[PDB]
């Protein structure tokens, strides 16, 4: 049972919440230990450390336990988990925003009116199948938390879209080398997330 390089659909049969265990785990680690870490996601962990952890998880899905930072934790273990999460999305056979949405994404990106643009993207998001919908929701909420902590992590919106856009969004169908298409798709996605996805549940009853 492999984790990386397989369709997102095939991973969520185990999960009642429809987000793969590896994605939940990595986000938990960065949420708890990494939101204030300078250069989180901008820092590329050692490719050999990403590979070792990747391969261990592919051998046994129970090895997502290894993603939790062993005590005492180090900066580089946290960087590693960020790079691992990015590699997960990059290794998916299809983009989490599917290639088939390219044309409708192109249409979306020409719309000058912001309200029209976000409602348009909402429609695209609402129509995603479950696996993509719930997984994209978890990742987008996480990335917005990262942005909320910019004063410490020094990640601006555009840097975050350079890092994540080519991983999440499909390429320009009319131009394979245009990096701005995926970057802009990522910005519109972040902008719309407040209205496109239901909020995470609130845990305070004191």
Describe this structure in a few short sentences.
It is classed as cell cycle. The chain is mainly alpha-helical and 206 residues long. It is 59% helix and 0% strand.
Distance between the termini: 43 Å
The CATH class label is Mainly Alpha
**Rg, nearest Å:** 17 Å
Assess the beta-strand content as a share of residues.
under 5%
The fold-level CATH name is: Phosphatidylinositol 3-kinase, Chain A
Largest sheet composition: none
Provide the CATH superfamily. Rho GTPase activation protein
User: What is the helix fraction of residues, given as a range?
Assistant: 55-70%
Structural class: mainly alpha
Shape verdict: globular
Helix and strand string, N-terminal first? HHHHHHHHHH
Question: What multimeric state do the chains show?
Answer: monomer
- The number of distinct structural domains comes to 1
**Count of distinct strands:** 0
CATH architecture group name: Orthogonal Bundle
- SS summary, helix count: 10
């Amino acid at each position: 049972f492999k984790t990386f390089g397989v369709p997102l659909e095939s991973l969520i049969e185990f999960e009642q919440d429809m987000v793969p265990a590896i994605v939940r785990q990595c986000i938990y680690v960065i949420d708890k230990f990494g939101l204030d870490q300078e250069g989180i996601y901008r820092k590329s962990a050692n490719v050999l450390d990403v590979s070792k952890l990747k391969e261990e998880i592919d051998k046994d899905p129970a090895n997502i336990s290894m993603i939790l930072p062993s005590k005492p934790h180090s900066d580089s273990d946290i960087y590693l988990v960020g790079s691992l999460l990015k590699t997960f999305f990059a290794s998916l056979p299809d983009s989490v925003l599917p290639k088939a949405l390219s044309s409708e994404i192109k249409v979306c990106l020409q719309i000058e009116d912001p309200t029209t643009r976000k409602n348009f993207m909402h429609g695209l998001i609402y129509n995603l199948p479950d696996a993509q919908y719930w997984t994209l929701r978890a990742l987008v909420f996480h990335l917005k938390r990262v942005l909320a902590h910019e004063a410490q992590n020094r990640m601006n919106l555009r840097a975050l879209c350079i890092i994540w856009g080519p991983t999440i969004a499909p390429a320009n169908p009319d131009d394979a080398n245009d990096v701005n298409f995926q970057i802009m798709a990522m910005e519109v996605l972040l902008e719309v997330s407040d209205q496109a996805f239901e909020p995470e549940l609130e845990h305070h009853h004191h």
